């Protein structure tokens, strides 16, 4: 009888301790939950992104042979928007002018022929070019997705062969 009550009280005390562990913004609790999410995402995407990034680095280093202005921002039309893209010197990967801490600055178009979007894109090239984003490993490490397996996207193969 007494032993049952003591075990009861012990279980309630352990429940209170676990409640404190869970609802007190503990560092260990937060790190364990973060690791549970991060491990699954890494297992899903990291190696595939690395292989794809190496392939496109090889492709862009082949493409950059004989061209001198391929490492300068040009405003590429992607149908529904403009993107200020160049080819990264170090990795020979597509690079685009970034919008804050998000993805590339996609200047939307209100029709097929939008002079204003083109001109704002040129303004970004002249002014907002200090912040850039790169497809593949950098995009995966900054935004959590690589962009090579999402469509439509300026890094994806379908949007670039269309």
């Amino acid at each position: 009888k007494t032993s049952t009550l003591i075990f009861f009280v012990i279980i309630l005390a352990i429940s209170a301790l676990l409640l404190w562990f869970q609802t007190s913004d503990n560092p260990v609790f937060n790190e364990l939950t973060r690791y549970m999410r991060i491990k699954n995402t890494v297992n899903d995407w990291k190696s595939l992104t690395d292989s794809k990034t190496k392939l496109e680095s090889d492709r862009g280093r082949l493409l950059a042979a004989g061209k001198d202005d391929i490492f300068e921002f040009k405003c590429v039309d992607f149908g529904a928007y403009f993107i200020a893209m160049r080819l990264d010197k170090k990795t020979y990967l597509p690079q685009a002018i970034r919008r804050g801490t998000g993805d590339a600055w996609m200047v939307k178009k209100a029709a097929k022929v939008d002079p204003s979007a083109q001109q704002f894109c040129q303004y970004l090239i002249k002014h907002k070019s200090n912040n850039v984003i790169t497809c593949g490993n950098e995009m995966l490490n900054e935004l959590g997705y690589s962009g090579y397996f999402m469509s439509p996207h300026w890094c994806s193969d379908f949007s670039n062969m269309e």
């Binding site: 469509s151 379908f158 062969m161």
Partner: protein, 111 residues
């Protein structure tokens, strides 16, 4: 009597714990899980079209037919099929009647 009520309470416990463990309880979790579900749907729909090289009979004119080997890339998010034939990409919009009437004989004559 007592056993039935205790079993009912225990089953209610199990159901509530299962829901709170394996189902979304806030907007972040719900958004993440719906992202995953929509991505899986899109991926399987894209995988419906055979991405491996397939042999079809392609009419290069009104009355001339030739055997050819083509590759198909389907993107159901925007609804387009890109057919690589003779090294050239042909983009067919699935919302266009003429594109449908051109692509469907290619798909239905595959072997």
């Amino acid at each position: 009597m007592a056993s039935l009520l205790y079993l009912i309470l225990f089953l209610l416990f199990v159901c509530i714990s299962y829901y709170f463990t394996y189902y979304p309880t806030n907007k972040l979790q719900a958004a993440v899980m719906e992202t995953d579900r929509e991505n899986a749907i899109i991926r399987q729909r894209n995988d419906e079209i055979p991405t491996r090289t397939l042999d079809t009979a392609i009419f290069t004119d009104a009355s001339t037919v030739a055997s050819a080997q083509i590759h198909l890339y389907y993107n159901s998010n925007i609804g387009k099929i890109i057919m690589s034939l003779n090294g050239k990409k042909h983009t067919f919009n699935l919302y266009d009647d003429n594109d449908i009437r051109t692509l469907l004989p290619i798909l239905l004559l595959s072997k």
